[PDB]
Amino acid sequence: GLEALMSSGRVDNLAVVMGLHPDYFTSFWRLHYLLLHTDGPLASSWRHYIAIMAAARHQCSYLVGSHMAEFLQTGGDPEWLLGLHRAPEKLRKLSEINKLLAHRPWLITKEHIQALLKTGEHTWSLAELIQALVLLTHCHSLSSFVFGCGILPEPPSEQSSPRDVEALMERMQQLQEEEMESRFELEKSESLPDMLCFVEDPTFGYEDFTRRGAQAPPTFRAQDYTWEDHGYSLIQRLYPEGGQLLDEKFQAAYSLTYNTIAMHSGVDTSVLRRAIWNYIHCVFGIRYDDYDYGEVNQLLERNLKVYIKTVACYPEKTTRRMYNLFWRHFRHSEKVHVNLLLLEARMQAALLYALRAITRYMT
């Protein structure tokens, strides 16, 4: 761990907790400094305001209150802090895609892209839009992390501080050696104040209460639009400096391992980490053609699925009891490792839907 920086008092509570995984922190910090402290398509004050609009979707005052202060220090018409209605209409056009990205990314549609790029007095360019999609999804995934790790405003965490594990290690060995479609639909269908003026439709979330029965996004076959050979290449064409940083951050988190499980070392944990990843993408409708989704229940205890899904979909509702309740014999560091596995998987899914809608509009 980046111990001297964490215990120094000079970086905030969020980065202190990221310090626990230096190989991820480096990739996280590079994209953080790019989006917020590097000249780009959009003015500094716009980027902090877009971040407020995003953190407001999850009622996440840690991130809202921090980008408010930055927005003021960087210029930033204070009157925009009275509510979205006082912001330029170009920013206001982002509410719909902001809400959809945060809660139901699969509903993003080329007709949404058409509205943003519609020629008017102040139109979004593609480089401006791509930077805005990265900021919105960045701050949604950072709200998941703030809530899932119990990060306190400016201990750095309300939840983290300065046997059946062997059952699990056995199930992982057995694995390291059609109706596939059925097991995916089963996993996907399973069911488990002053910020309000920066959002529209504040009670929109995962789970439609306008319809009986729980939320089941439409199955999207991965490989129809993947990061590796569709989304990455579109972002590096429209926003070069961020595409590479996002790719490195995605890979940083998908491959981060210490070869340990709870108290055990010498383990290969990729089958377990792939289940966390592939489950969250399943909660957002993405099906991997060659993956046995039965492995999710073999490997992810039920208390871990309730937490993962709460943090991906309803981070506001995360509780200390819920954090303590799963993986009771695991190290806190590993609970944090799960959180950043899931913000990266949640962010990649929201981006991919948005990037897919942009491709469809261009055609």
Ligand SMILES: CC(C)C[C@H](N)C(=O)O
């Ligand atoms: C338990 C898993 C979330 C991570 C594990 N500590 C590893 O090194 O891969």
